[PDB]
Amino acid sequence: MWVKILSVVGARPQFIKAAAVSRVLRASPGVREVLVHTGQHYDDNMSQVFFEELEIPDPDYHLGIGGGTHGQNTGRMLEAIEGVLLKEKPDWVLVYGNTDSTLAGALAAVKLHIPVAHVEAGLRSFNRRMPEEINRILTDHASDLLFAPTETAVQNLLREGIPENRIHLVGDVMYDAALHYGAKAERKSRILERLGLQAKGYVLATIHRAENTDDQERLRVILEALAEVHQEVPVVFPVHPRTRKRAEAFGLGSYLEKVVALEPVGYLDMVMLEKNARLIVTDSGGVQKEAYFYRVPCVTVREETEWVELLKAEWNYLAAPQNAKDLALTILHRMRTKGVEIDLYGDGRASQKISDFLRKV
Amino acid sequence: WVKILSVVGARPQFIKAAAVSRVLRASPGVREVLVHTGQHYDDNMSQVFFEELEIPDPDYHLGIGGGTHGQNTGRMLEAIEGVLLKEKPDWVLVYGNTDSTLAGALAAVKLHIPVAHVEAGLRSFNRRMPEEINRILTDHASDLLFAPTETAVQNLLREGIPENRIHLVGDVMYDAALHYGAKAERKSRILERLGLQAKGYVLATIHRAENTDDQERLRVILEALAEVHQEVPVVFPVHPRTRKRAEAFGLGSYLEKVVALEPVGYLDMVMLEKNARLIVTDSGGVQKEAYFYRVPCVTVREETEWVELLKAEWNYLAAPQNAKDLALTILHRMRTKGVEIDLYGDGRASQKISDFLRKVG
Ligand SMILES: CC(=O)N[C@H]1[C@@H](OP(=O)(O)OP(=O)(O)OC[C@H]2O[C@@H](n3ccc(=O)[nH]c3=O)[C@H](O)[C@@H]2O)O[C@H](C(=O)O)[C@@H](O)[C@@H]1NC(C)=O
Ligand SMILES: CC(=O)N[C@H]1[C@@H](OP(=O)(O)OP(=O)(O)OC[C@H]2O[C@@H](n3ccc(=O)[nH]c3=O)[C@H](O)[C@@H]2O)O[C@H](C(=O)O)[C@@H](O)[C@@H]1NC(C)=O
Ligand SMILES: CC(=O)N[C@H]1[C@@H](OP(=O)(O)OP(=O)(O)OC[C@H]2O[C@@H](n3ccc(=O)[nH]c3=O)[C@H](O)[C@@H]2O)O[C@H](CO)[C@@H](O)[C@@H]1O
Ligand SMILES: O=c1ccn([C@@H]2O[C@H](COP(=O)(O)OP(=O)(O)O)[C@@H](O)[C@H]2O)c(=O)[nH]1
């Protein structure tokens, strides 16, 4: 009767995915849900605020593992998570996205013959030097079920020999999350007030990819470009903590004072800020999809994206950070554009289709 | 001129590394560093190979072993990453498909260090095996893939890995057998010491987890060997996990009904394999080695990765379901030979491999 579904989460974006799938498994007939928090994101504004605001039950476990190397974080999460799998003996392990926590969770489980489902599977940058590309490839190939959010993602899995019958195109659970919590965002978040921002009276930015923040010249191009954009249209920038650290370390911390820079915000503020932005500048996977949700034009500050449908649809645009002034003009040019009318990422019921496919198989 | 670091951990890894390291020591300017994970630590599992096979002492002994998948893999991951940051090698070489192989590849790849997999692309199609996971994830984590067979090339192509990263080089274990054959013949008295002549016994090894971790499959095997022994002597160098399982299950007494040894060194092993009437094994290398010597083999498994041995009739699977049948199969196959065919290359897989590591850029 009770299938036990154990969820491994470690990062902000995973807490948000999980909140959509938890909601649905909670009120599932005879499903017990166990939640493990790897500890990867520990700070109040990267972790706790999402459990509080998205009504996610307290983790059954917090492994408290974070802030080391790839080897340390992964290695220990592997040992710790196995310890919990041995105690809890679940029927399914679900992993999310593509961090070291995703891979450690999966790898812990497959070695115990515990089935593994990958929520958000089959995405590819085709840059194998990226640690996130390796995590998603190794995760997909270790899983038993692959919950694809797009047709591209499905073709990507088929191309690497993974069979039809283990792939389910379910759309994106982060679209579910945006539907379920938008109202709560309306009636709780006053961030437009607190910042004194008029709706569609600003540009919203996030930047945290390692290929953008570890490289001084890239990080400088971006912060220069955003400060120019701000002269013309205010830039709001909840600054990822690693990004903050890197810009302080290379002596770029002044460009952050020259825009409206914030510590990281919870999901409800973020929804509000995203919704009411004239345009969104990001290097985030989640934020670029979210821009499309609200039909706000987007610029992706990378050489590629895994979300190729947003480019085809013209809601999203690549601007690699080679030149501060070029990137500024690209941003400012794109804010009076829009994309075509199209429905991606499903019906807002990816989580429920996932719940269903898990009680059958 | 270029630094190549090897991660070995267990007996079959030392035998493969031996062949390759012999070629690399000849190569102009190539420094080798050798990391022994600690996975095998008994002297007749580790030390003996280093001595008889002329392998320089490991540059590092991490001393990890005896734990779960989680524990070993995790601790190895962190530890190898430690060495790799110290040694900053240009290449990491990983062999076969133990937990050490995988910790090796994962440590290396998150550090942007090229990984070459010796013995790449083999597939059991059984994901319950820890070792199937191991080679799948290793192959997907590698930049070079030294495949030993045309099957393994095909296996890799079907999982989306490009032709340009796959090289069919043959098997370094044939290079091994070839180079150490005269030495084993000259130095091994294993026959004298046991009181055996040629062709007047049967050699057996068993250590798969799937065979040893399950009481009833192990009983089947031990009883079937005990029966065969009544008809033709059975010589059984017993893996320590296999002995420790036999003791914990009460099945110790079966090992008196055969010629049970402690594990032997490569030199004694060659002589045993060479002069056997039939080999019965759940081992990877031993299957191939039985064909090296034109000795019929029986593989006490549900599948093998070495499928060409079945097609050429050198080998024959016999899953352990029934003591009486397993014994019968074993005795029947004594009367068979395979077809004359060359497999596994010309004995210079190690040179091809060295050649590729140097001229890769
Ligand atoms: C490039 C890359 O690999 N990315 C992977 C990465 O996600 P990601 O890039 O989106 O990181 P991230 O931007 O922190 O999260 C966004 C969320 O935070 C919210 N968000 C953002 C900022 C903020 O201040 N407050 C806030 O609530 C936003 O509203 C939004 O909902 O980790 C994910 C994970 O493992 O699950 C993978 O699915 C991704 N893989 C892909 C392919 O997109
Ligand atoms: C089933 C499986 O995955 N197997 C993998 C496994 O090796 P394996 O199954 O062959 O274990 P194993 O039999 O201990 O050693 C054989 C050698 O020991 C010598 N040997 C054996 C017994 C003895 O007493 N003395 C001795 O010298 C023999 O002469 C012989 O040369 O780990 C390997 C590794 O990671 O490198 C993978 O390459 C293998 N994958 C394959 C695909 O064969
Ligand atoms: C999951 C994994 O990596 N499996 C590999 C491992 O099997 P193997 O059976 O050796 O797996 P482990 O390395 O986990 O060792 C199993 C157990 O054997 C005992 N032990 C081990 C080594 C030793 O010197 N003394 C001793 O007593 C310990 O109790 C240990 O836990 O190496 C074999 C080589 O022979 C390979 O065929 C297997 O693919
Ligand atoms: O709660 C948190 C999470 C992360 N970080 C910082 O942000 C970095 C992000 O690294 P993490 O391992 O979390 O993410 P990855 O880059 O591996 O996806 C960490 O190293 C820390 O410097 C932080 O300050 N607080």
Author numbering:
A (entry chain A): 1 to 361
B (entry chain B): 2 to 362
What does the literature reporting this entry say, word for word?
The final step in the pathway is catalyzed by a 2-epimerase, which utilizes UDP-2,3-diacetamido-2,3-dideoxy-d-glucuronic acid as its substrate. We have also demonstrated that the T. thermophilus enzyme is allosterically regulated by UDP-GlcNAc. Whereas the sugar 2-epimerases that function on UDP-GlcNAc have been the focus of past biochemical and structural analyses, this is the first detailed investigation of a 2-epimerase that specifically utilizes UDP-2,3-diacetamido-2,3-dideoxy-d-glucuronic acid as its substrate.
In an attempt to trap the UDP-sugar substrate in the active site, we subsequently constructed the D98N variant and crystallized it at pH 7.0 in the presence of UDP-GlcNAc3NAcA (structure 4). Again, the asymmetric unit contained a dimer (α-carbons of the two subunits superimpose with an RMSD of 0.4 Å). The model was refined to an overall R-factor of 19.5% at 2.2 Å resolution. Unambiguous electron density corresponding to the UDP-substrate was observed in each subunit. Surprisingly, however, in subunits A and B, there were also electron densities corresponding to UDP and UDP-GlcNAc, respectively, albeit at lower occupancies as can be seen in Figure 7, A and B. Importantly, these ligands were not included in the crystallization trials. The UDP in subunit A and the UDP-GlcNAc in subunit B align closely with the exception of their β-phosphoryl groups. In subunit A, the β-phosphoryl group does not lie within 3.2 Å of any protein atoms, whereas in subunit B, it forms an electrostatic interaction with Arg 242. Although the electron densities of the exogenous ligands in structure 4 were unambiguous, we utilized a combination of protein denaturation, HPLC, and mass spectrometry to verify their presence in the purified protein before the crystallization trials. As described in Experimental procedures, they were identified as UDP-GlcNAc and UDP.
